[PDB]
């Protein structure tokens, strides 16, 4: 069905952007820069450690949730 | 930037949703059913007359949108 | 849980915006002006009759559904 | 006009969502639990210390990028 096939396609491209290693690093380097919004050299360092450590895990979580589009658009009742 | 293909694709596939002659019938029948929520036999007819006449005009006007990404995807976060 | 708490809050606050009578006329004048897009003195008059009669009903129906966020976010299944 | 009035309304209420002190704590408690997605008493604690400290900073930019929808919706081609 067309609203299911489009939703599946959109979800597929969201997967393709999150797998893009340049996009993976853009968010990483962005949240690294976010840490510098507080001058604290110890907290900005600890922030960079947390960001660098958790974001690849979080991206893996979203990639694992963006896989199998049929199960995503179904949980949107856009599919059967 | 690459996410501009997303803005292009989402708009393009949504365009194919409105351009789908079958989807044009799906949206019509829901707004037709909306007319029957009032028992007035004169108003239910007049609503169907307005819906059958105006909705294709509304779809075509909105079809006039989403046609060219240059005036919609331009100057936002996904292409600039 | 947060995905439920956000959904409930968004639907509840958007509902109260739709209950704010200023929002009703904002939408109303668009559909009233929409009636002038077909040069039909009987249908453009009838269009306002359909718009002025059905839009307050439809807004009240949607306002009536957004009054209970529990049944709306359940229609997103995010609270289960 | 509705494409401008929608952006003005959405940005204003989206701002009001982040301004809600219940939403302010809910985002923390989700990200606090997010730190527990890595079973580490040393790193998850350092994450919780970072989360409680930086989340108010993140809200400030987004609130600041919502303290006037008219100047943002205009630079998105949505108003003028």
Numbering used by the authors:
A (entry chain B), B (entry chain C), C (entry chain D), D (entry chain A): 1 to 80
Paper text:
Here we present the crystal structure of a unique tetrameric assembly of murine saposin A produced serendipitously, following modifications of published protocols for making lipoprotein nanodiscs. Four SapA molecules in an open conformation form a diamond-shaped assembly possessing three orthogonal two-fold rotation axes. This symmetry is not perfect as the individual monomers possess small differences in the conformations of loop regions and the C-terminal helix (RMSDs 0.8–1.4 Å over 80 Cα residues), resulting in non-crystallographic symmetry of the tetramer. Each chain of the tetramer interacts directly with the three other chains burying a total surface area of 1210 Å2 for each monomer, representing approximately 20% of the SapA surface. The equivalent dimer within the tetramer structure is very different, possessing a head-to-head arrangement of monomers and substantial direct protein-protein interactions. Comparison of these structures suggests that the tetrameric assembly of SapA is not compatible with binding to GALC without some structural rearrangement. The core of the SapA tetramer structure is hollow and potentially solvent-accessible if it is not filled with amphipathic molecules. Considering the highly hydrophobic nature of the internal SapA surface, exposure of this hollow core to solvent would be thermodynamically unfavourable. It is therefore likely that disordered PC and/or DDM molecules are present in this internal cavity.
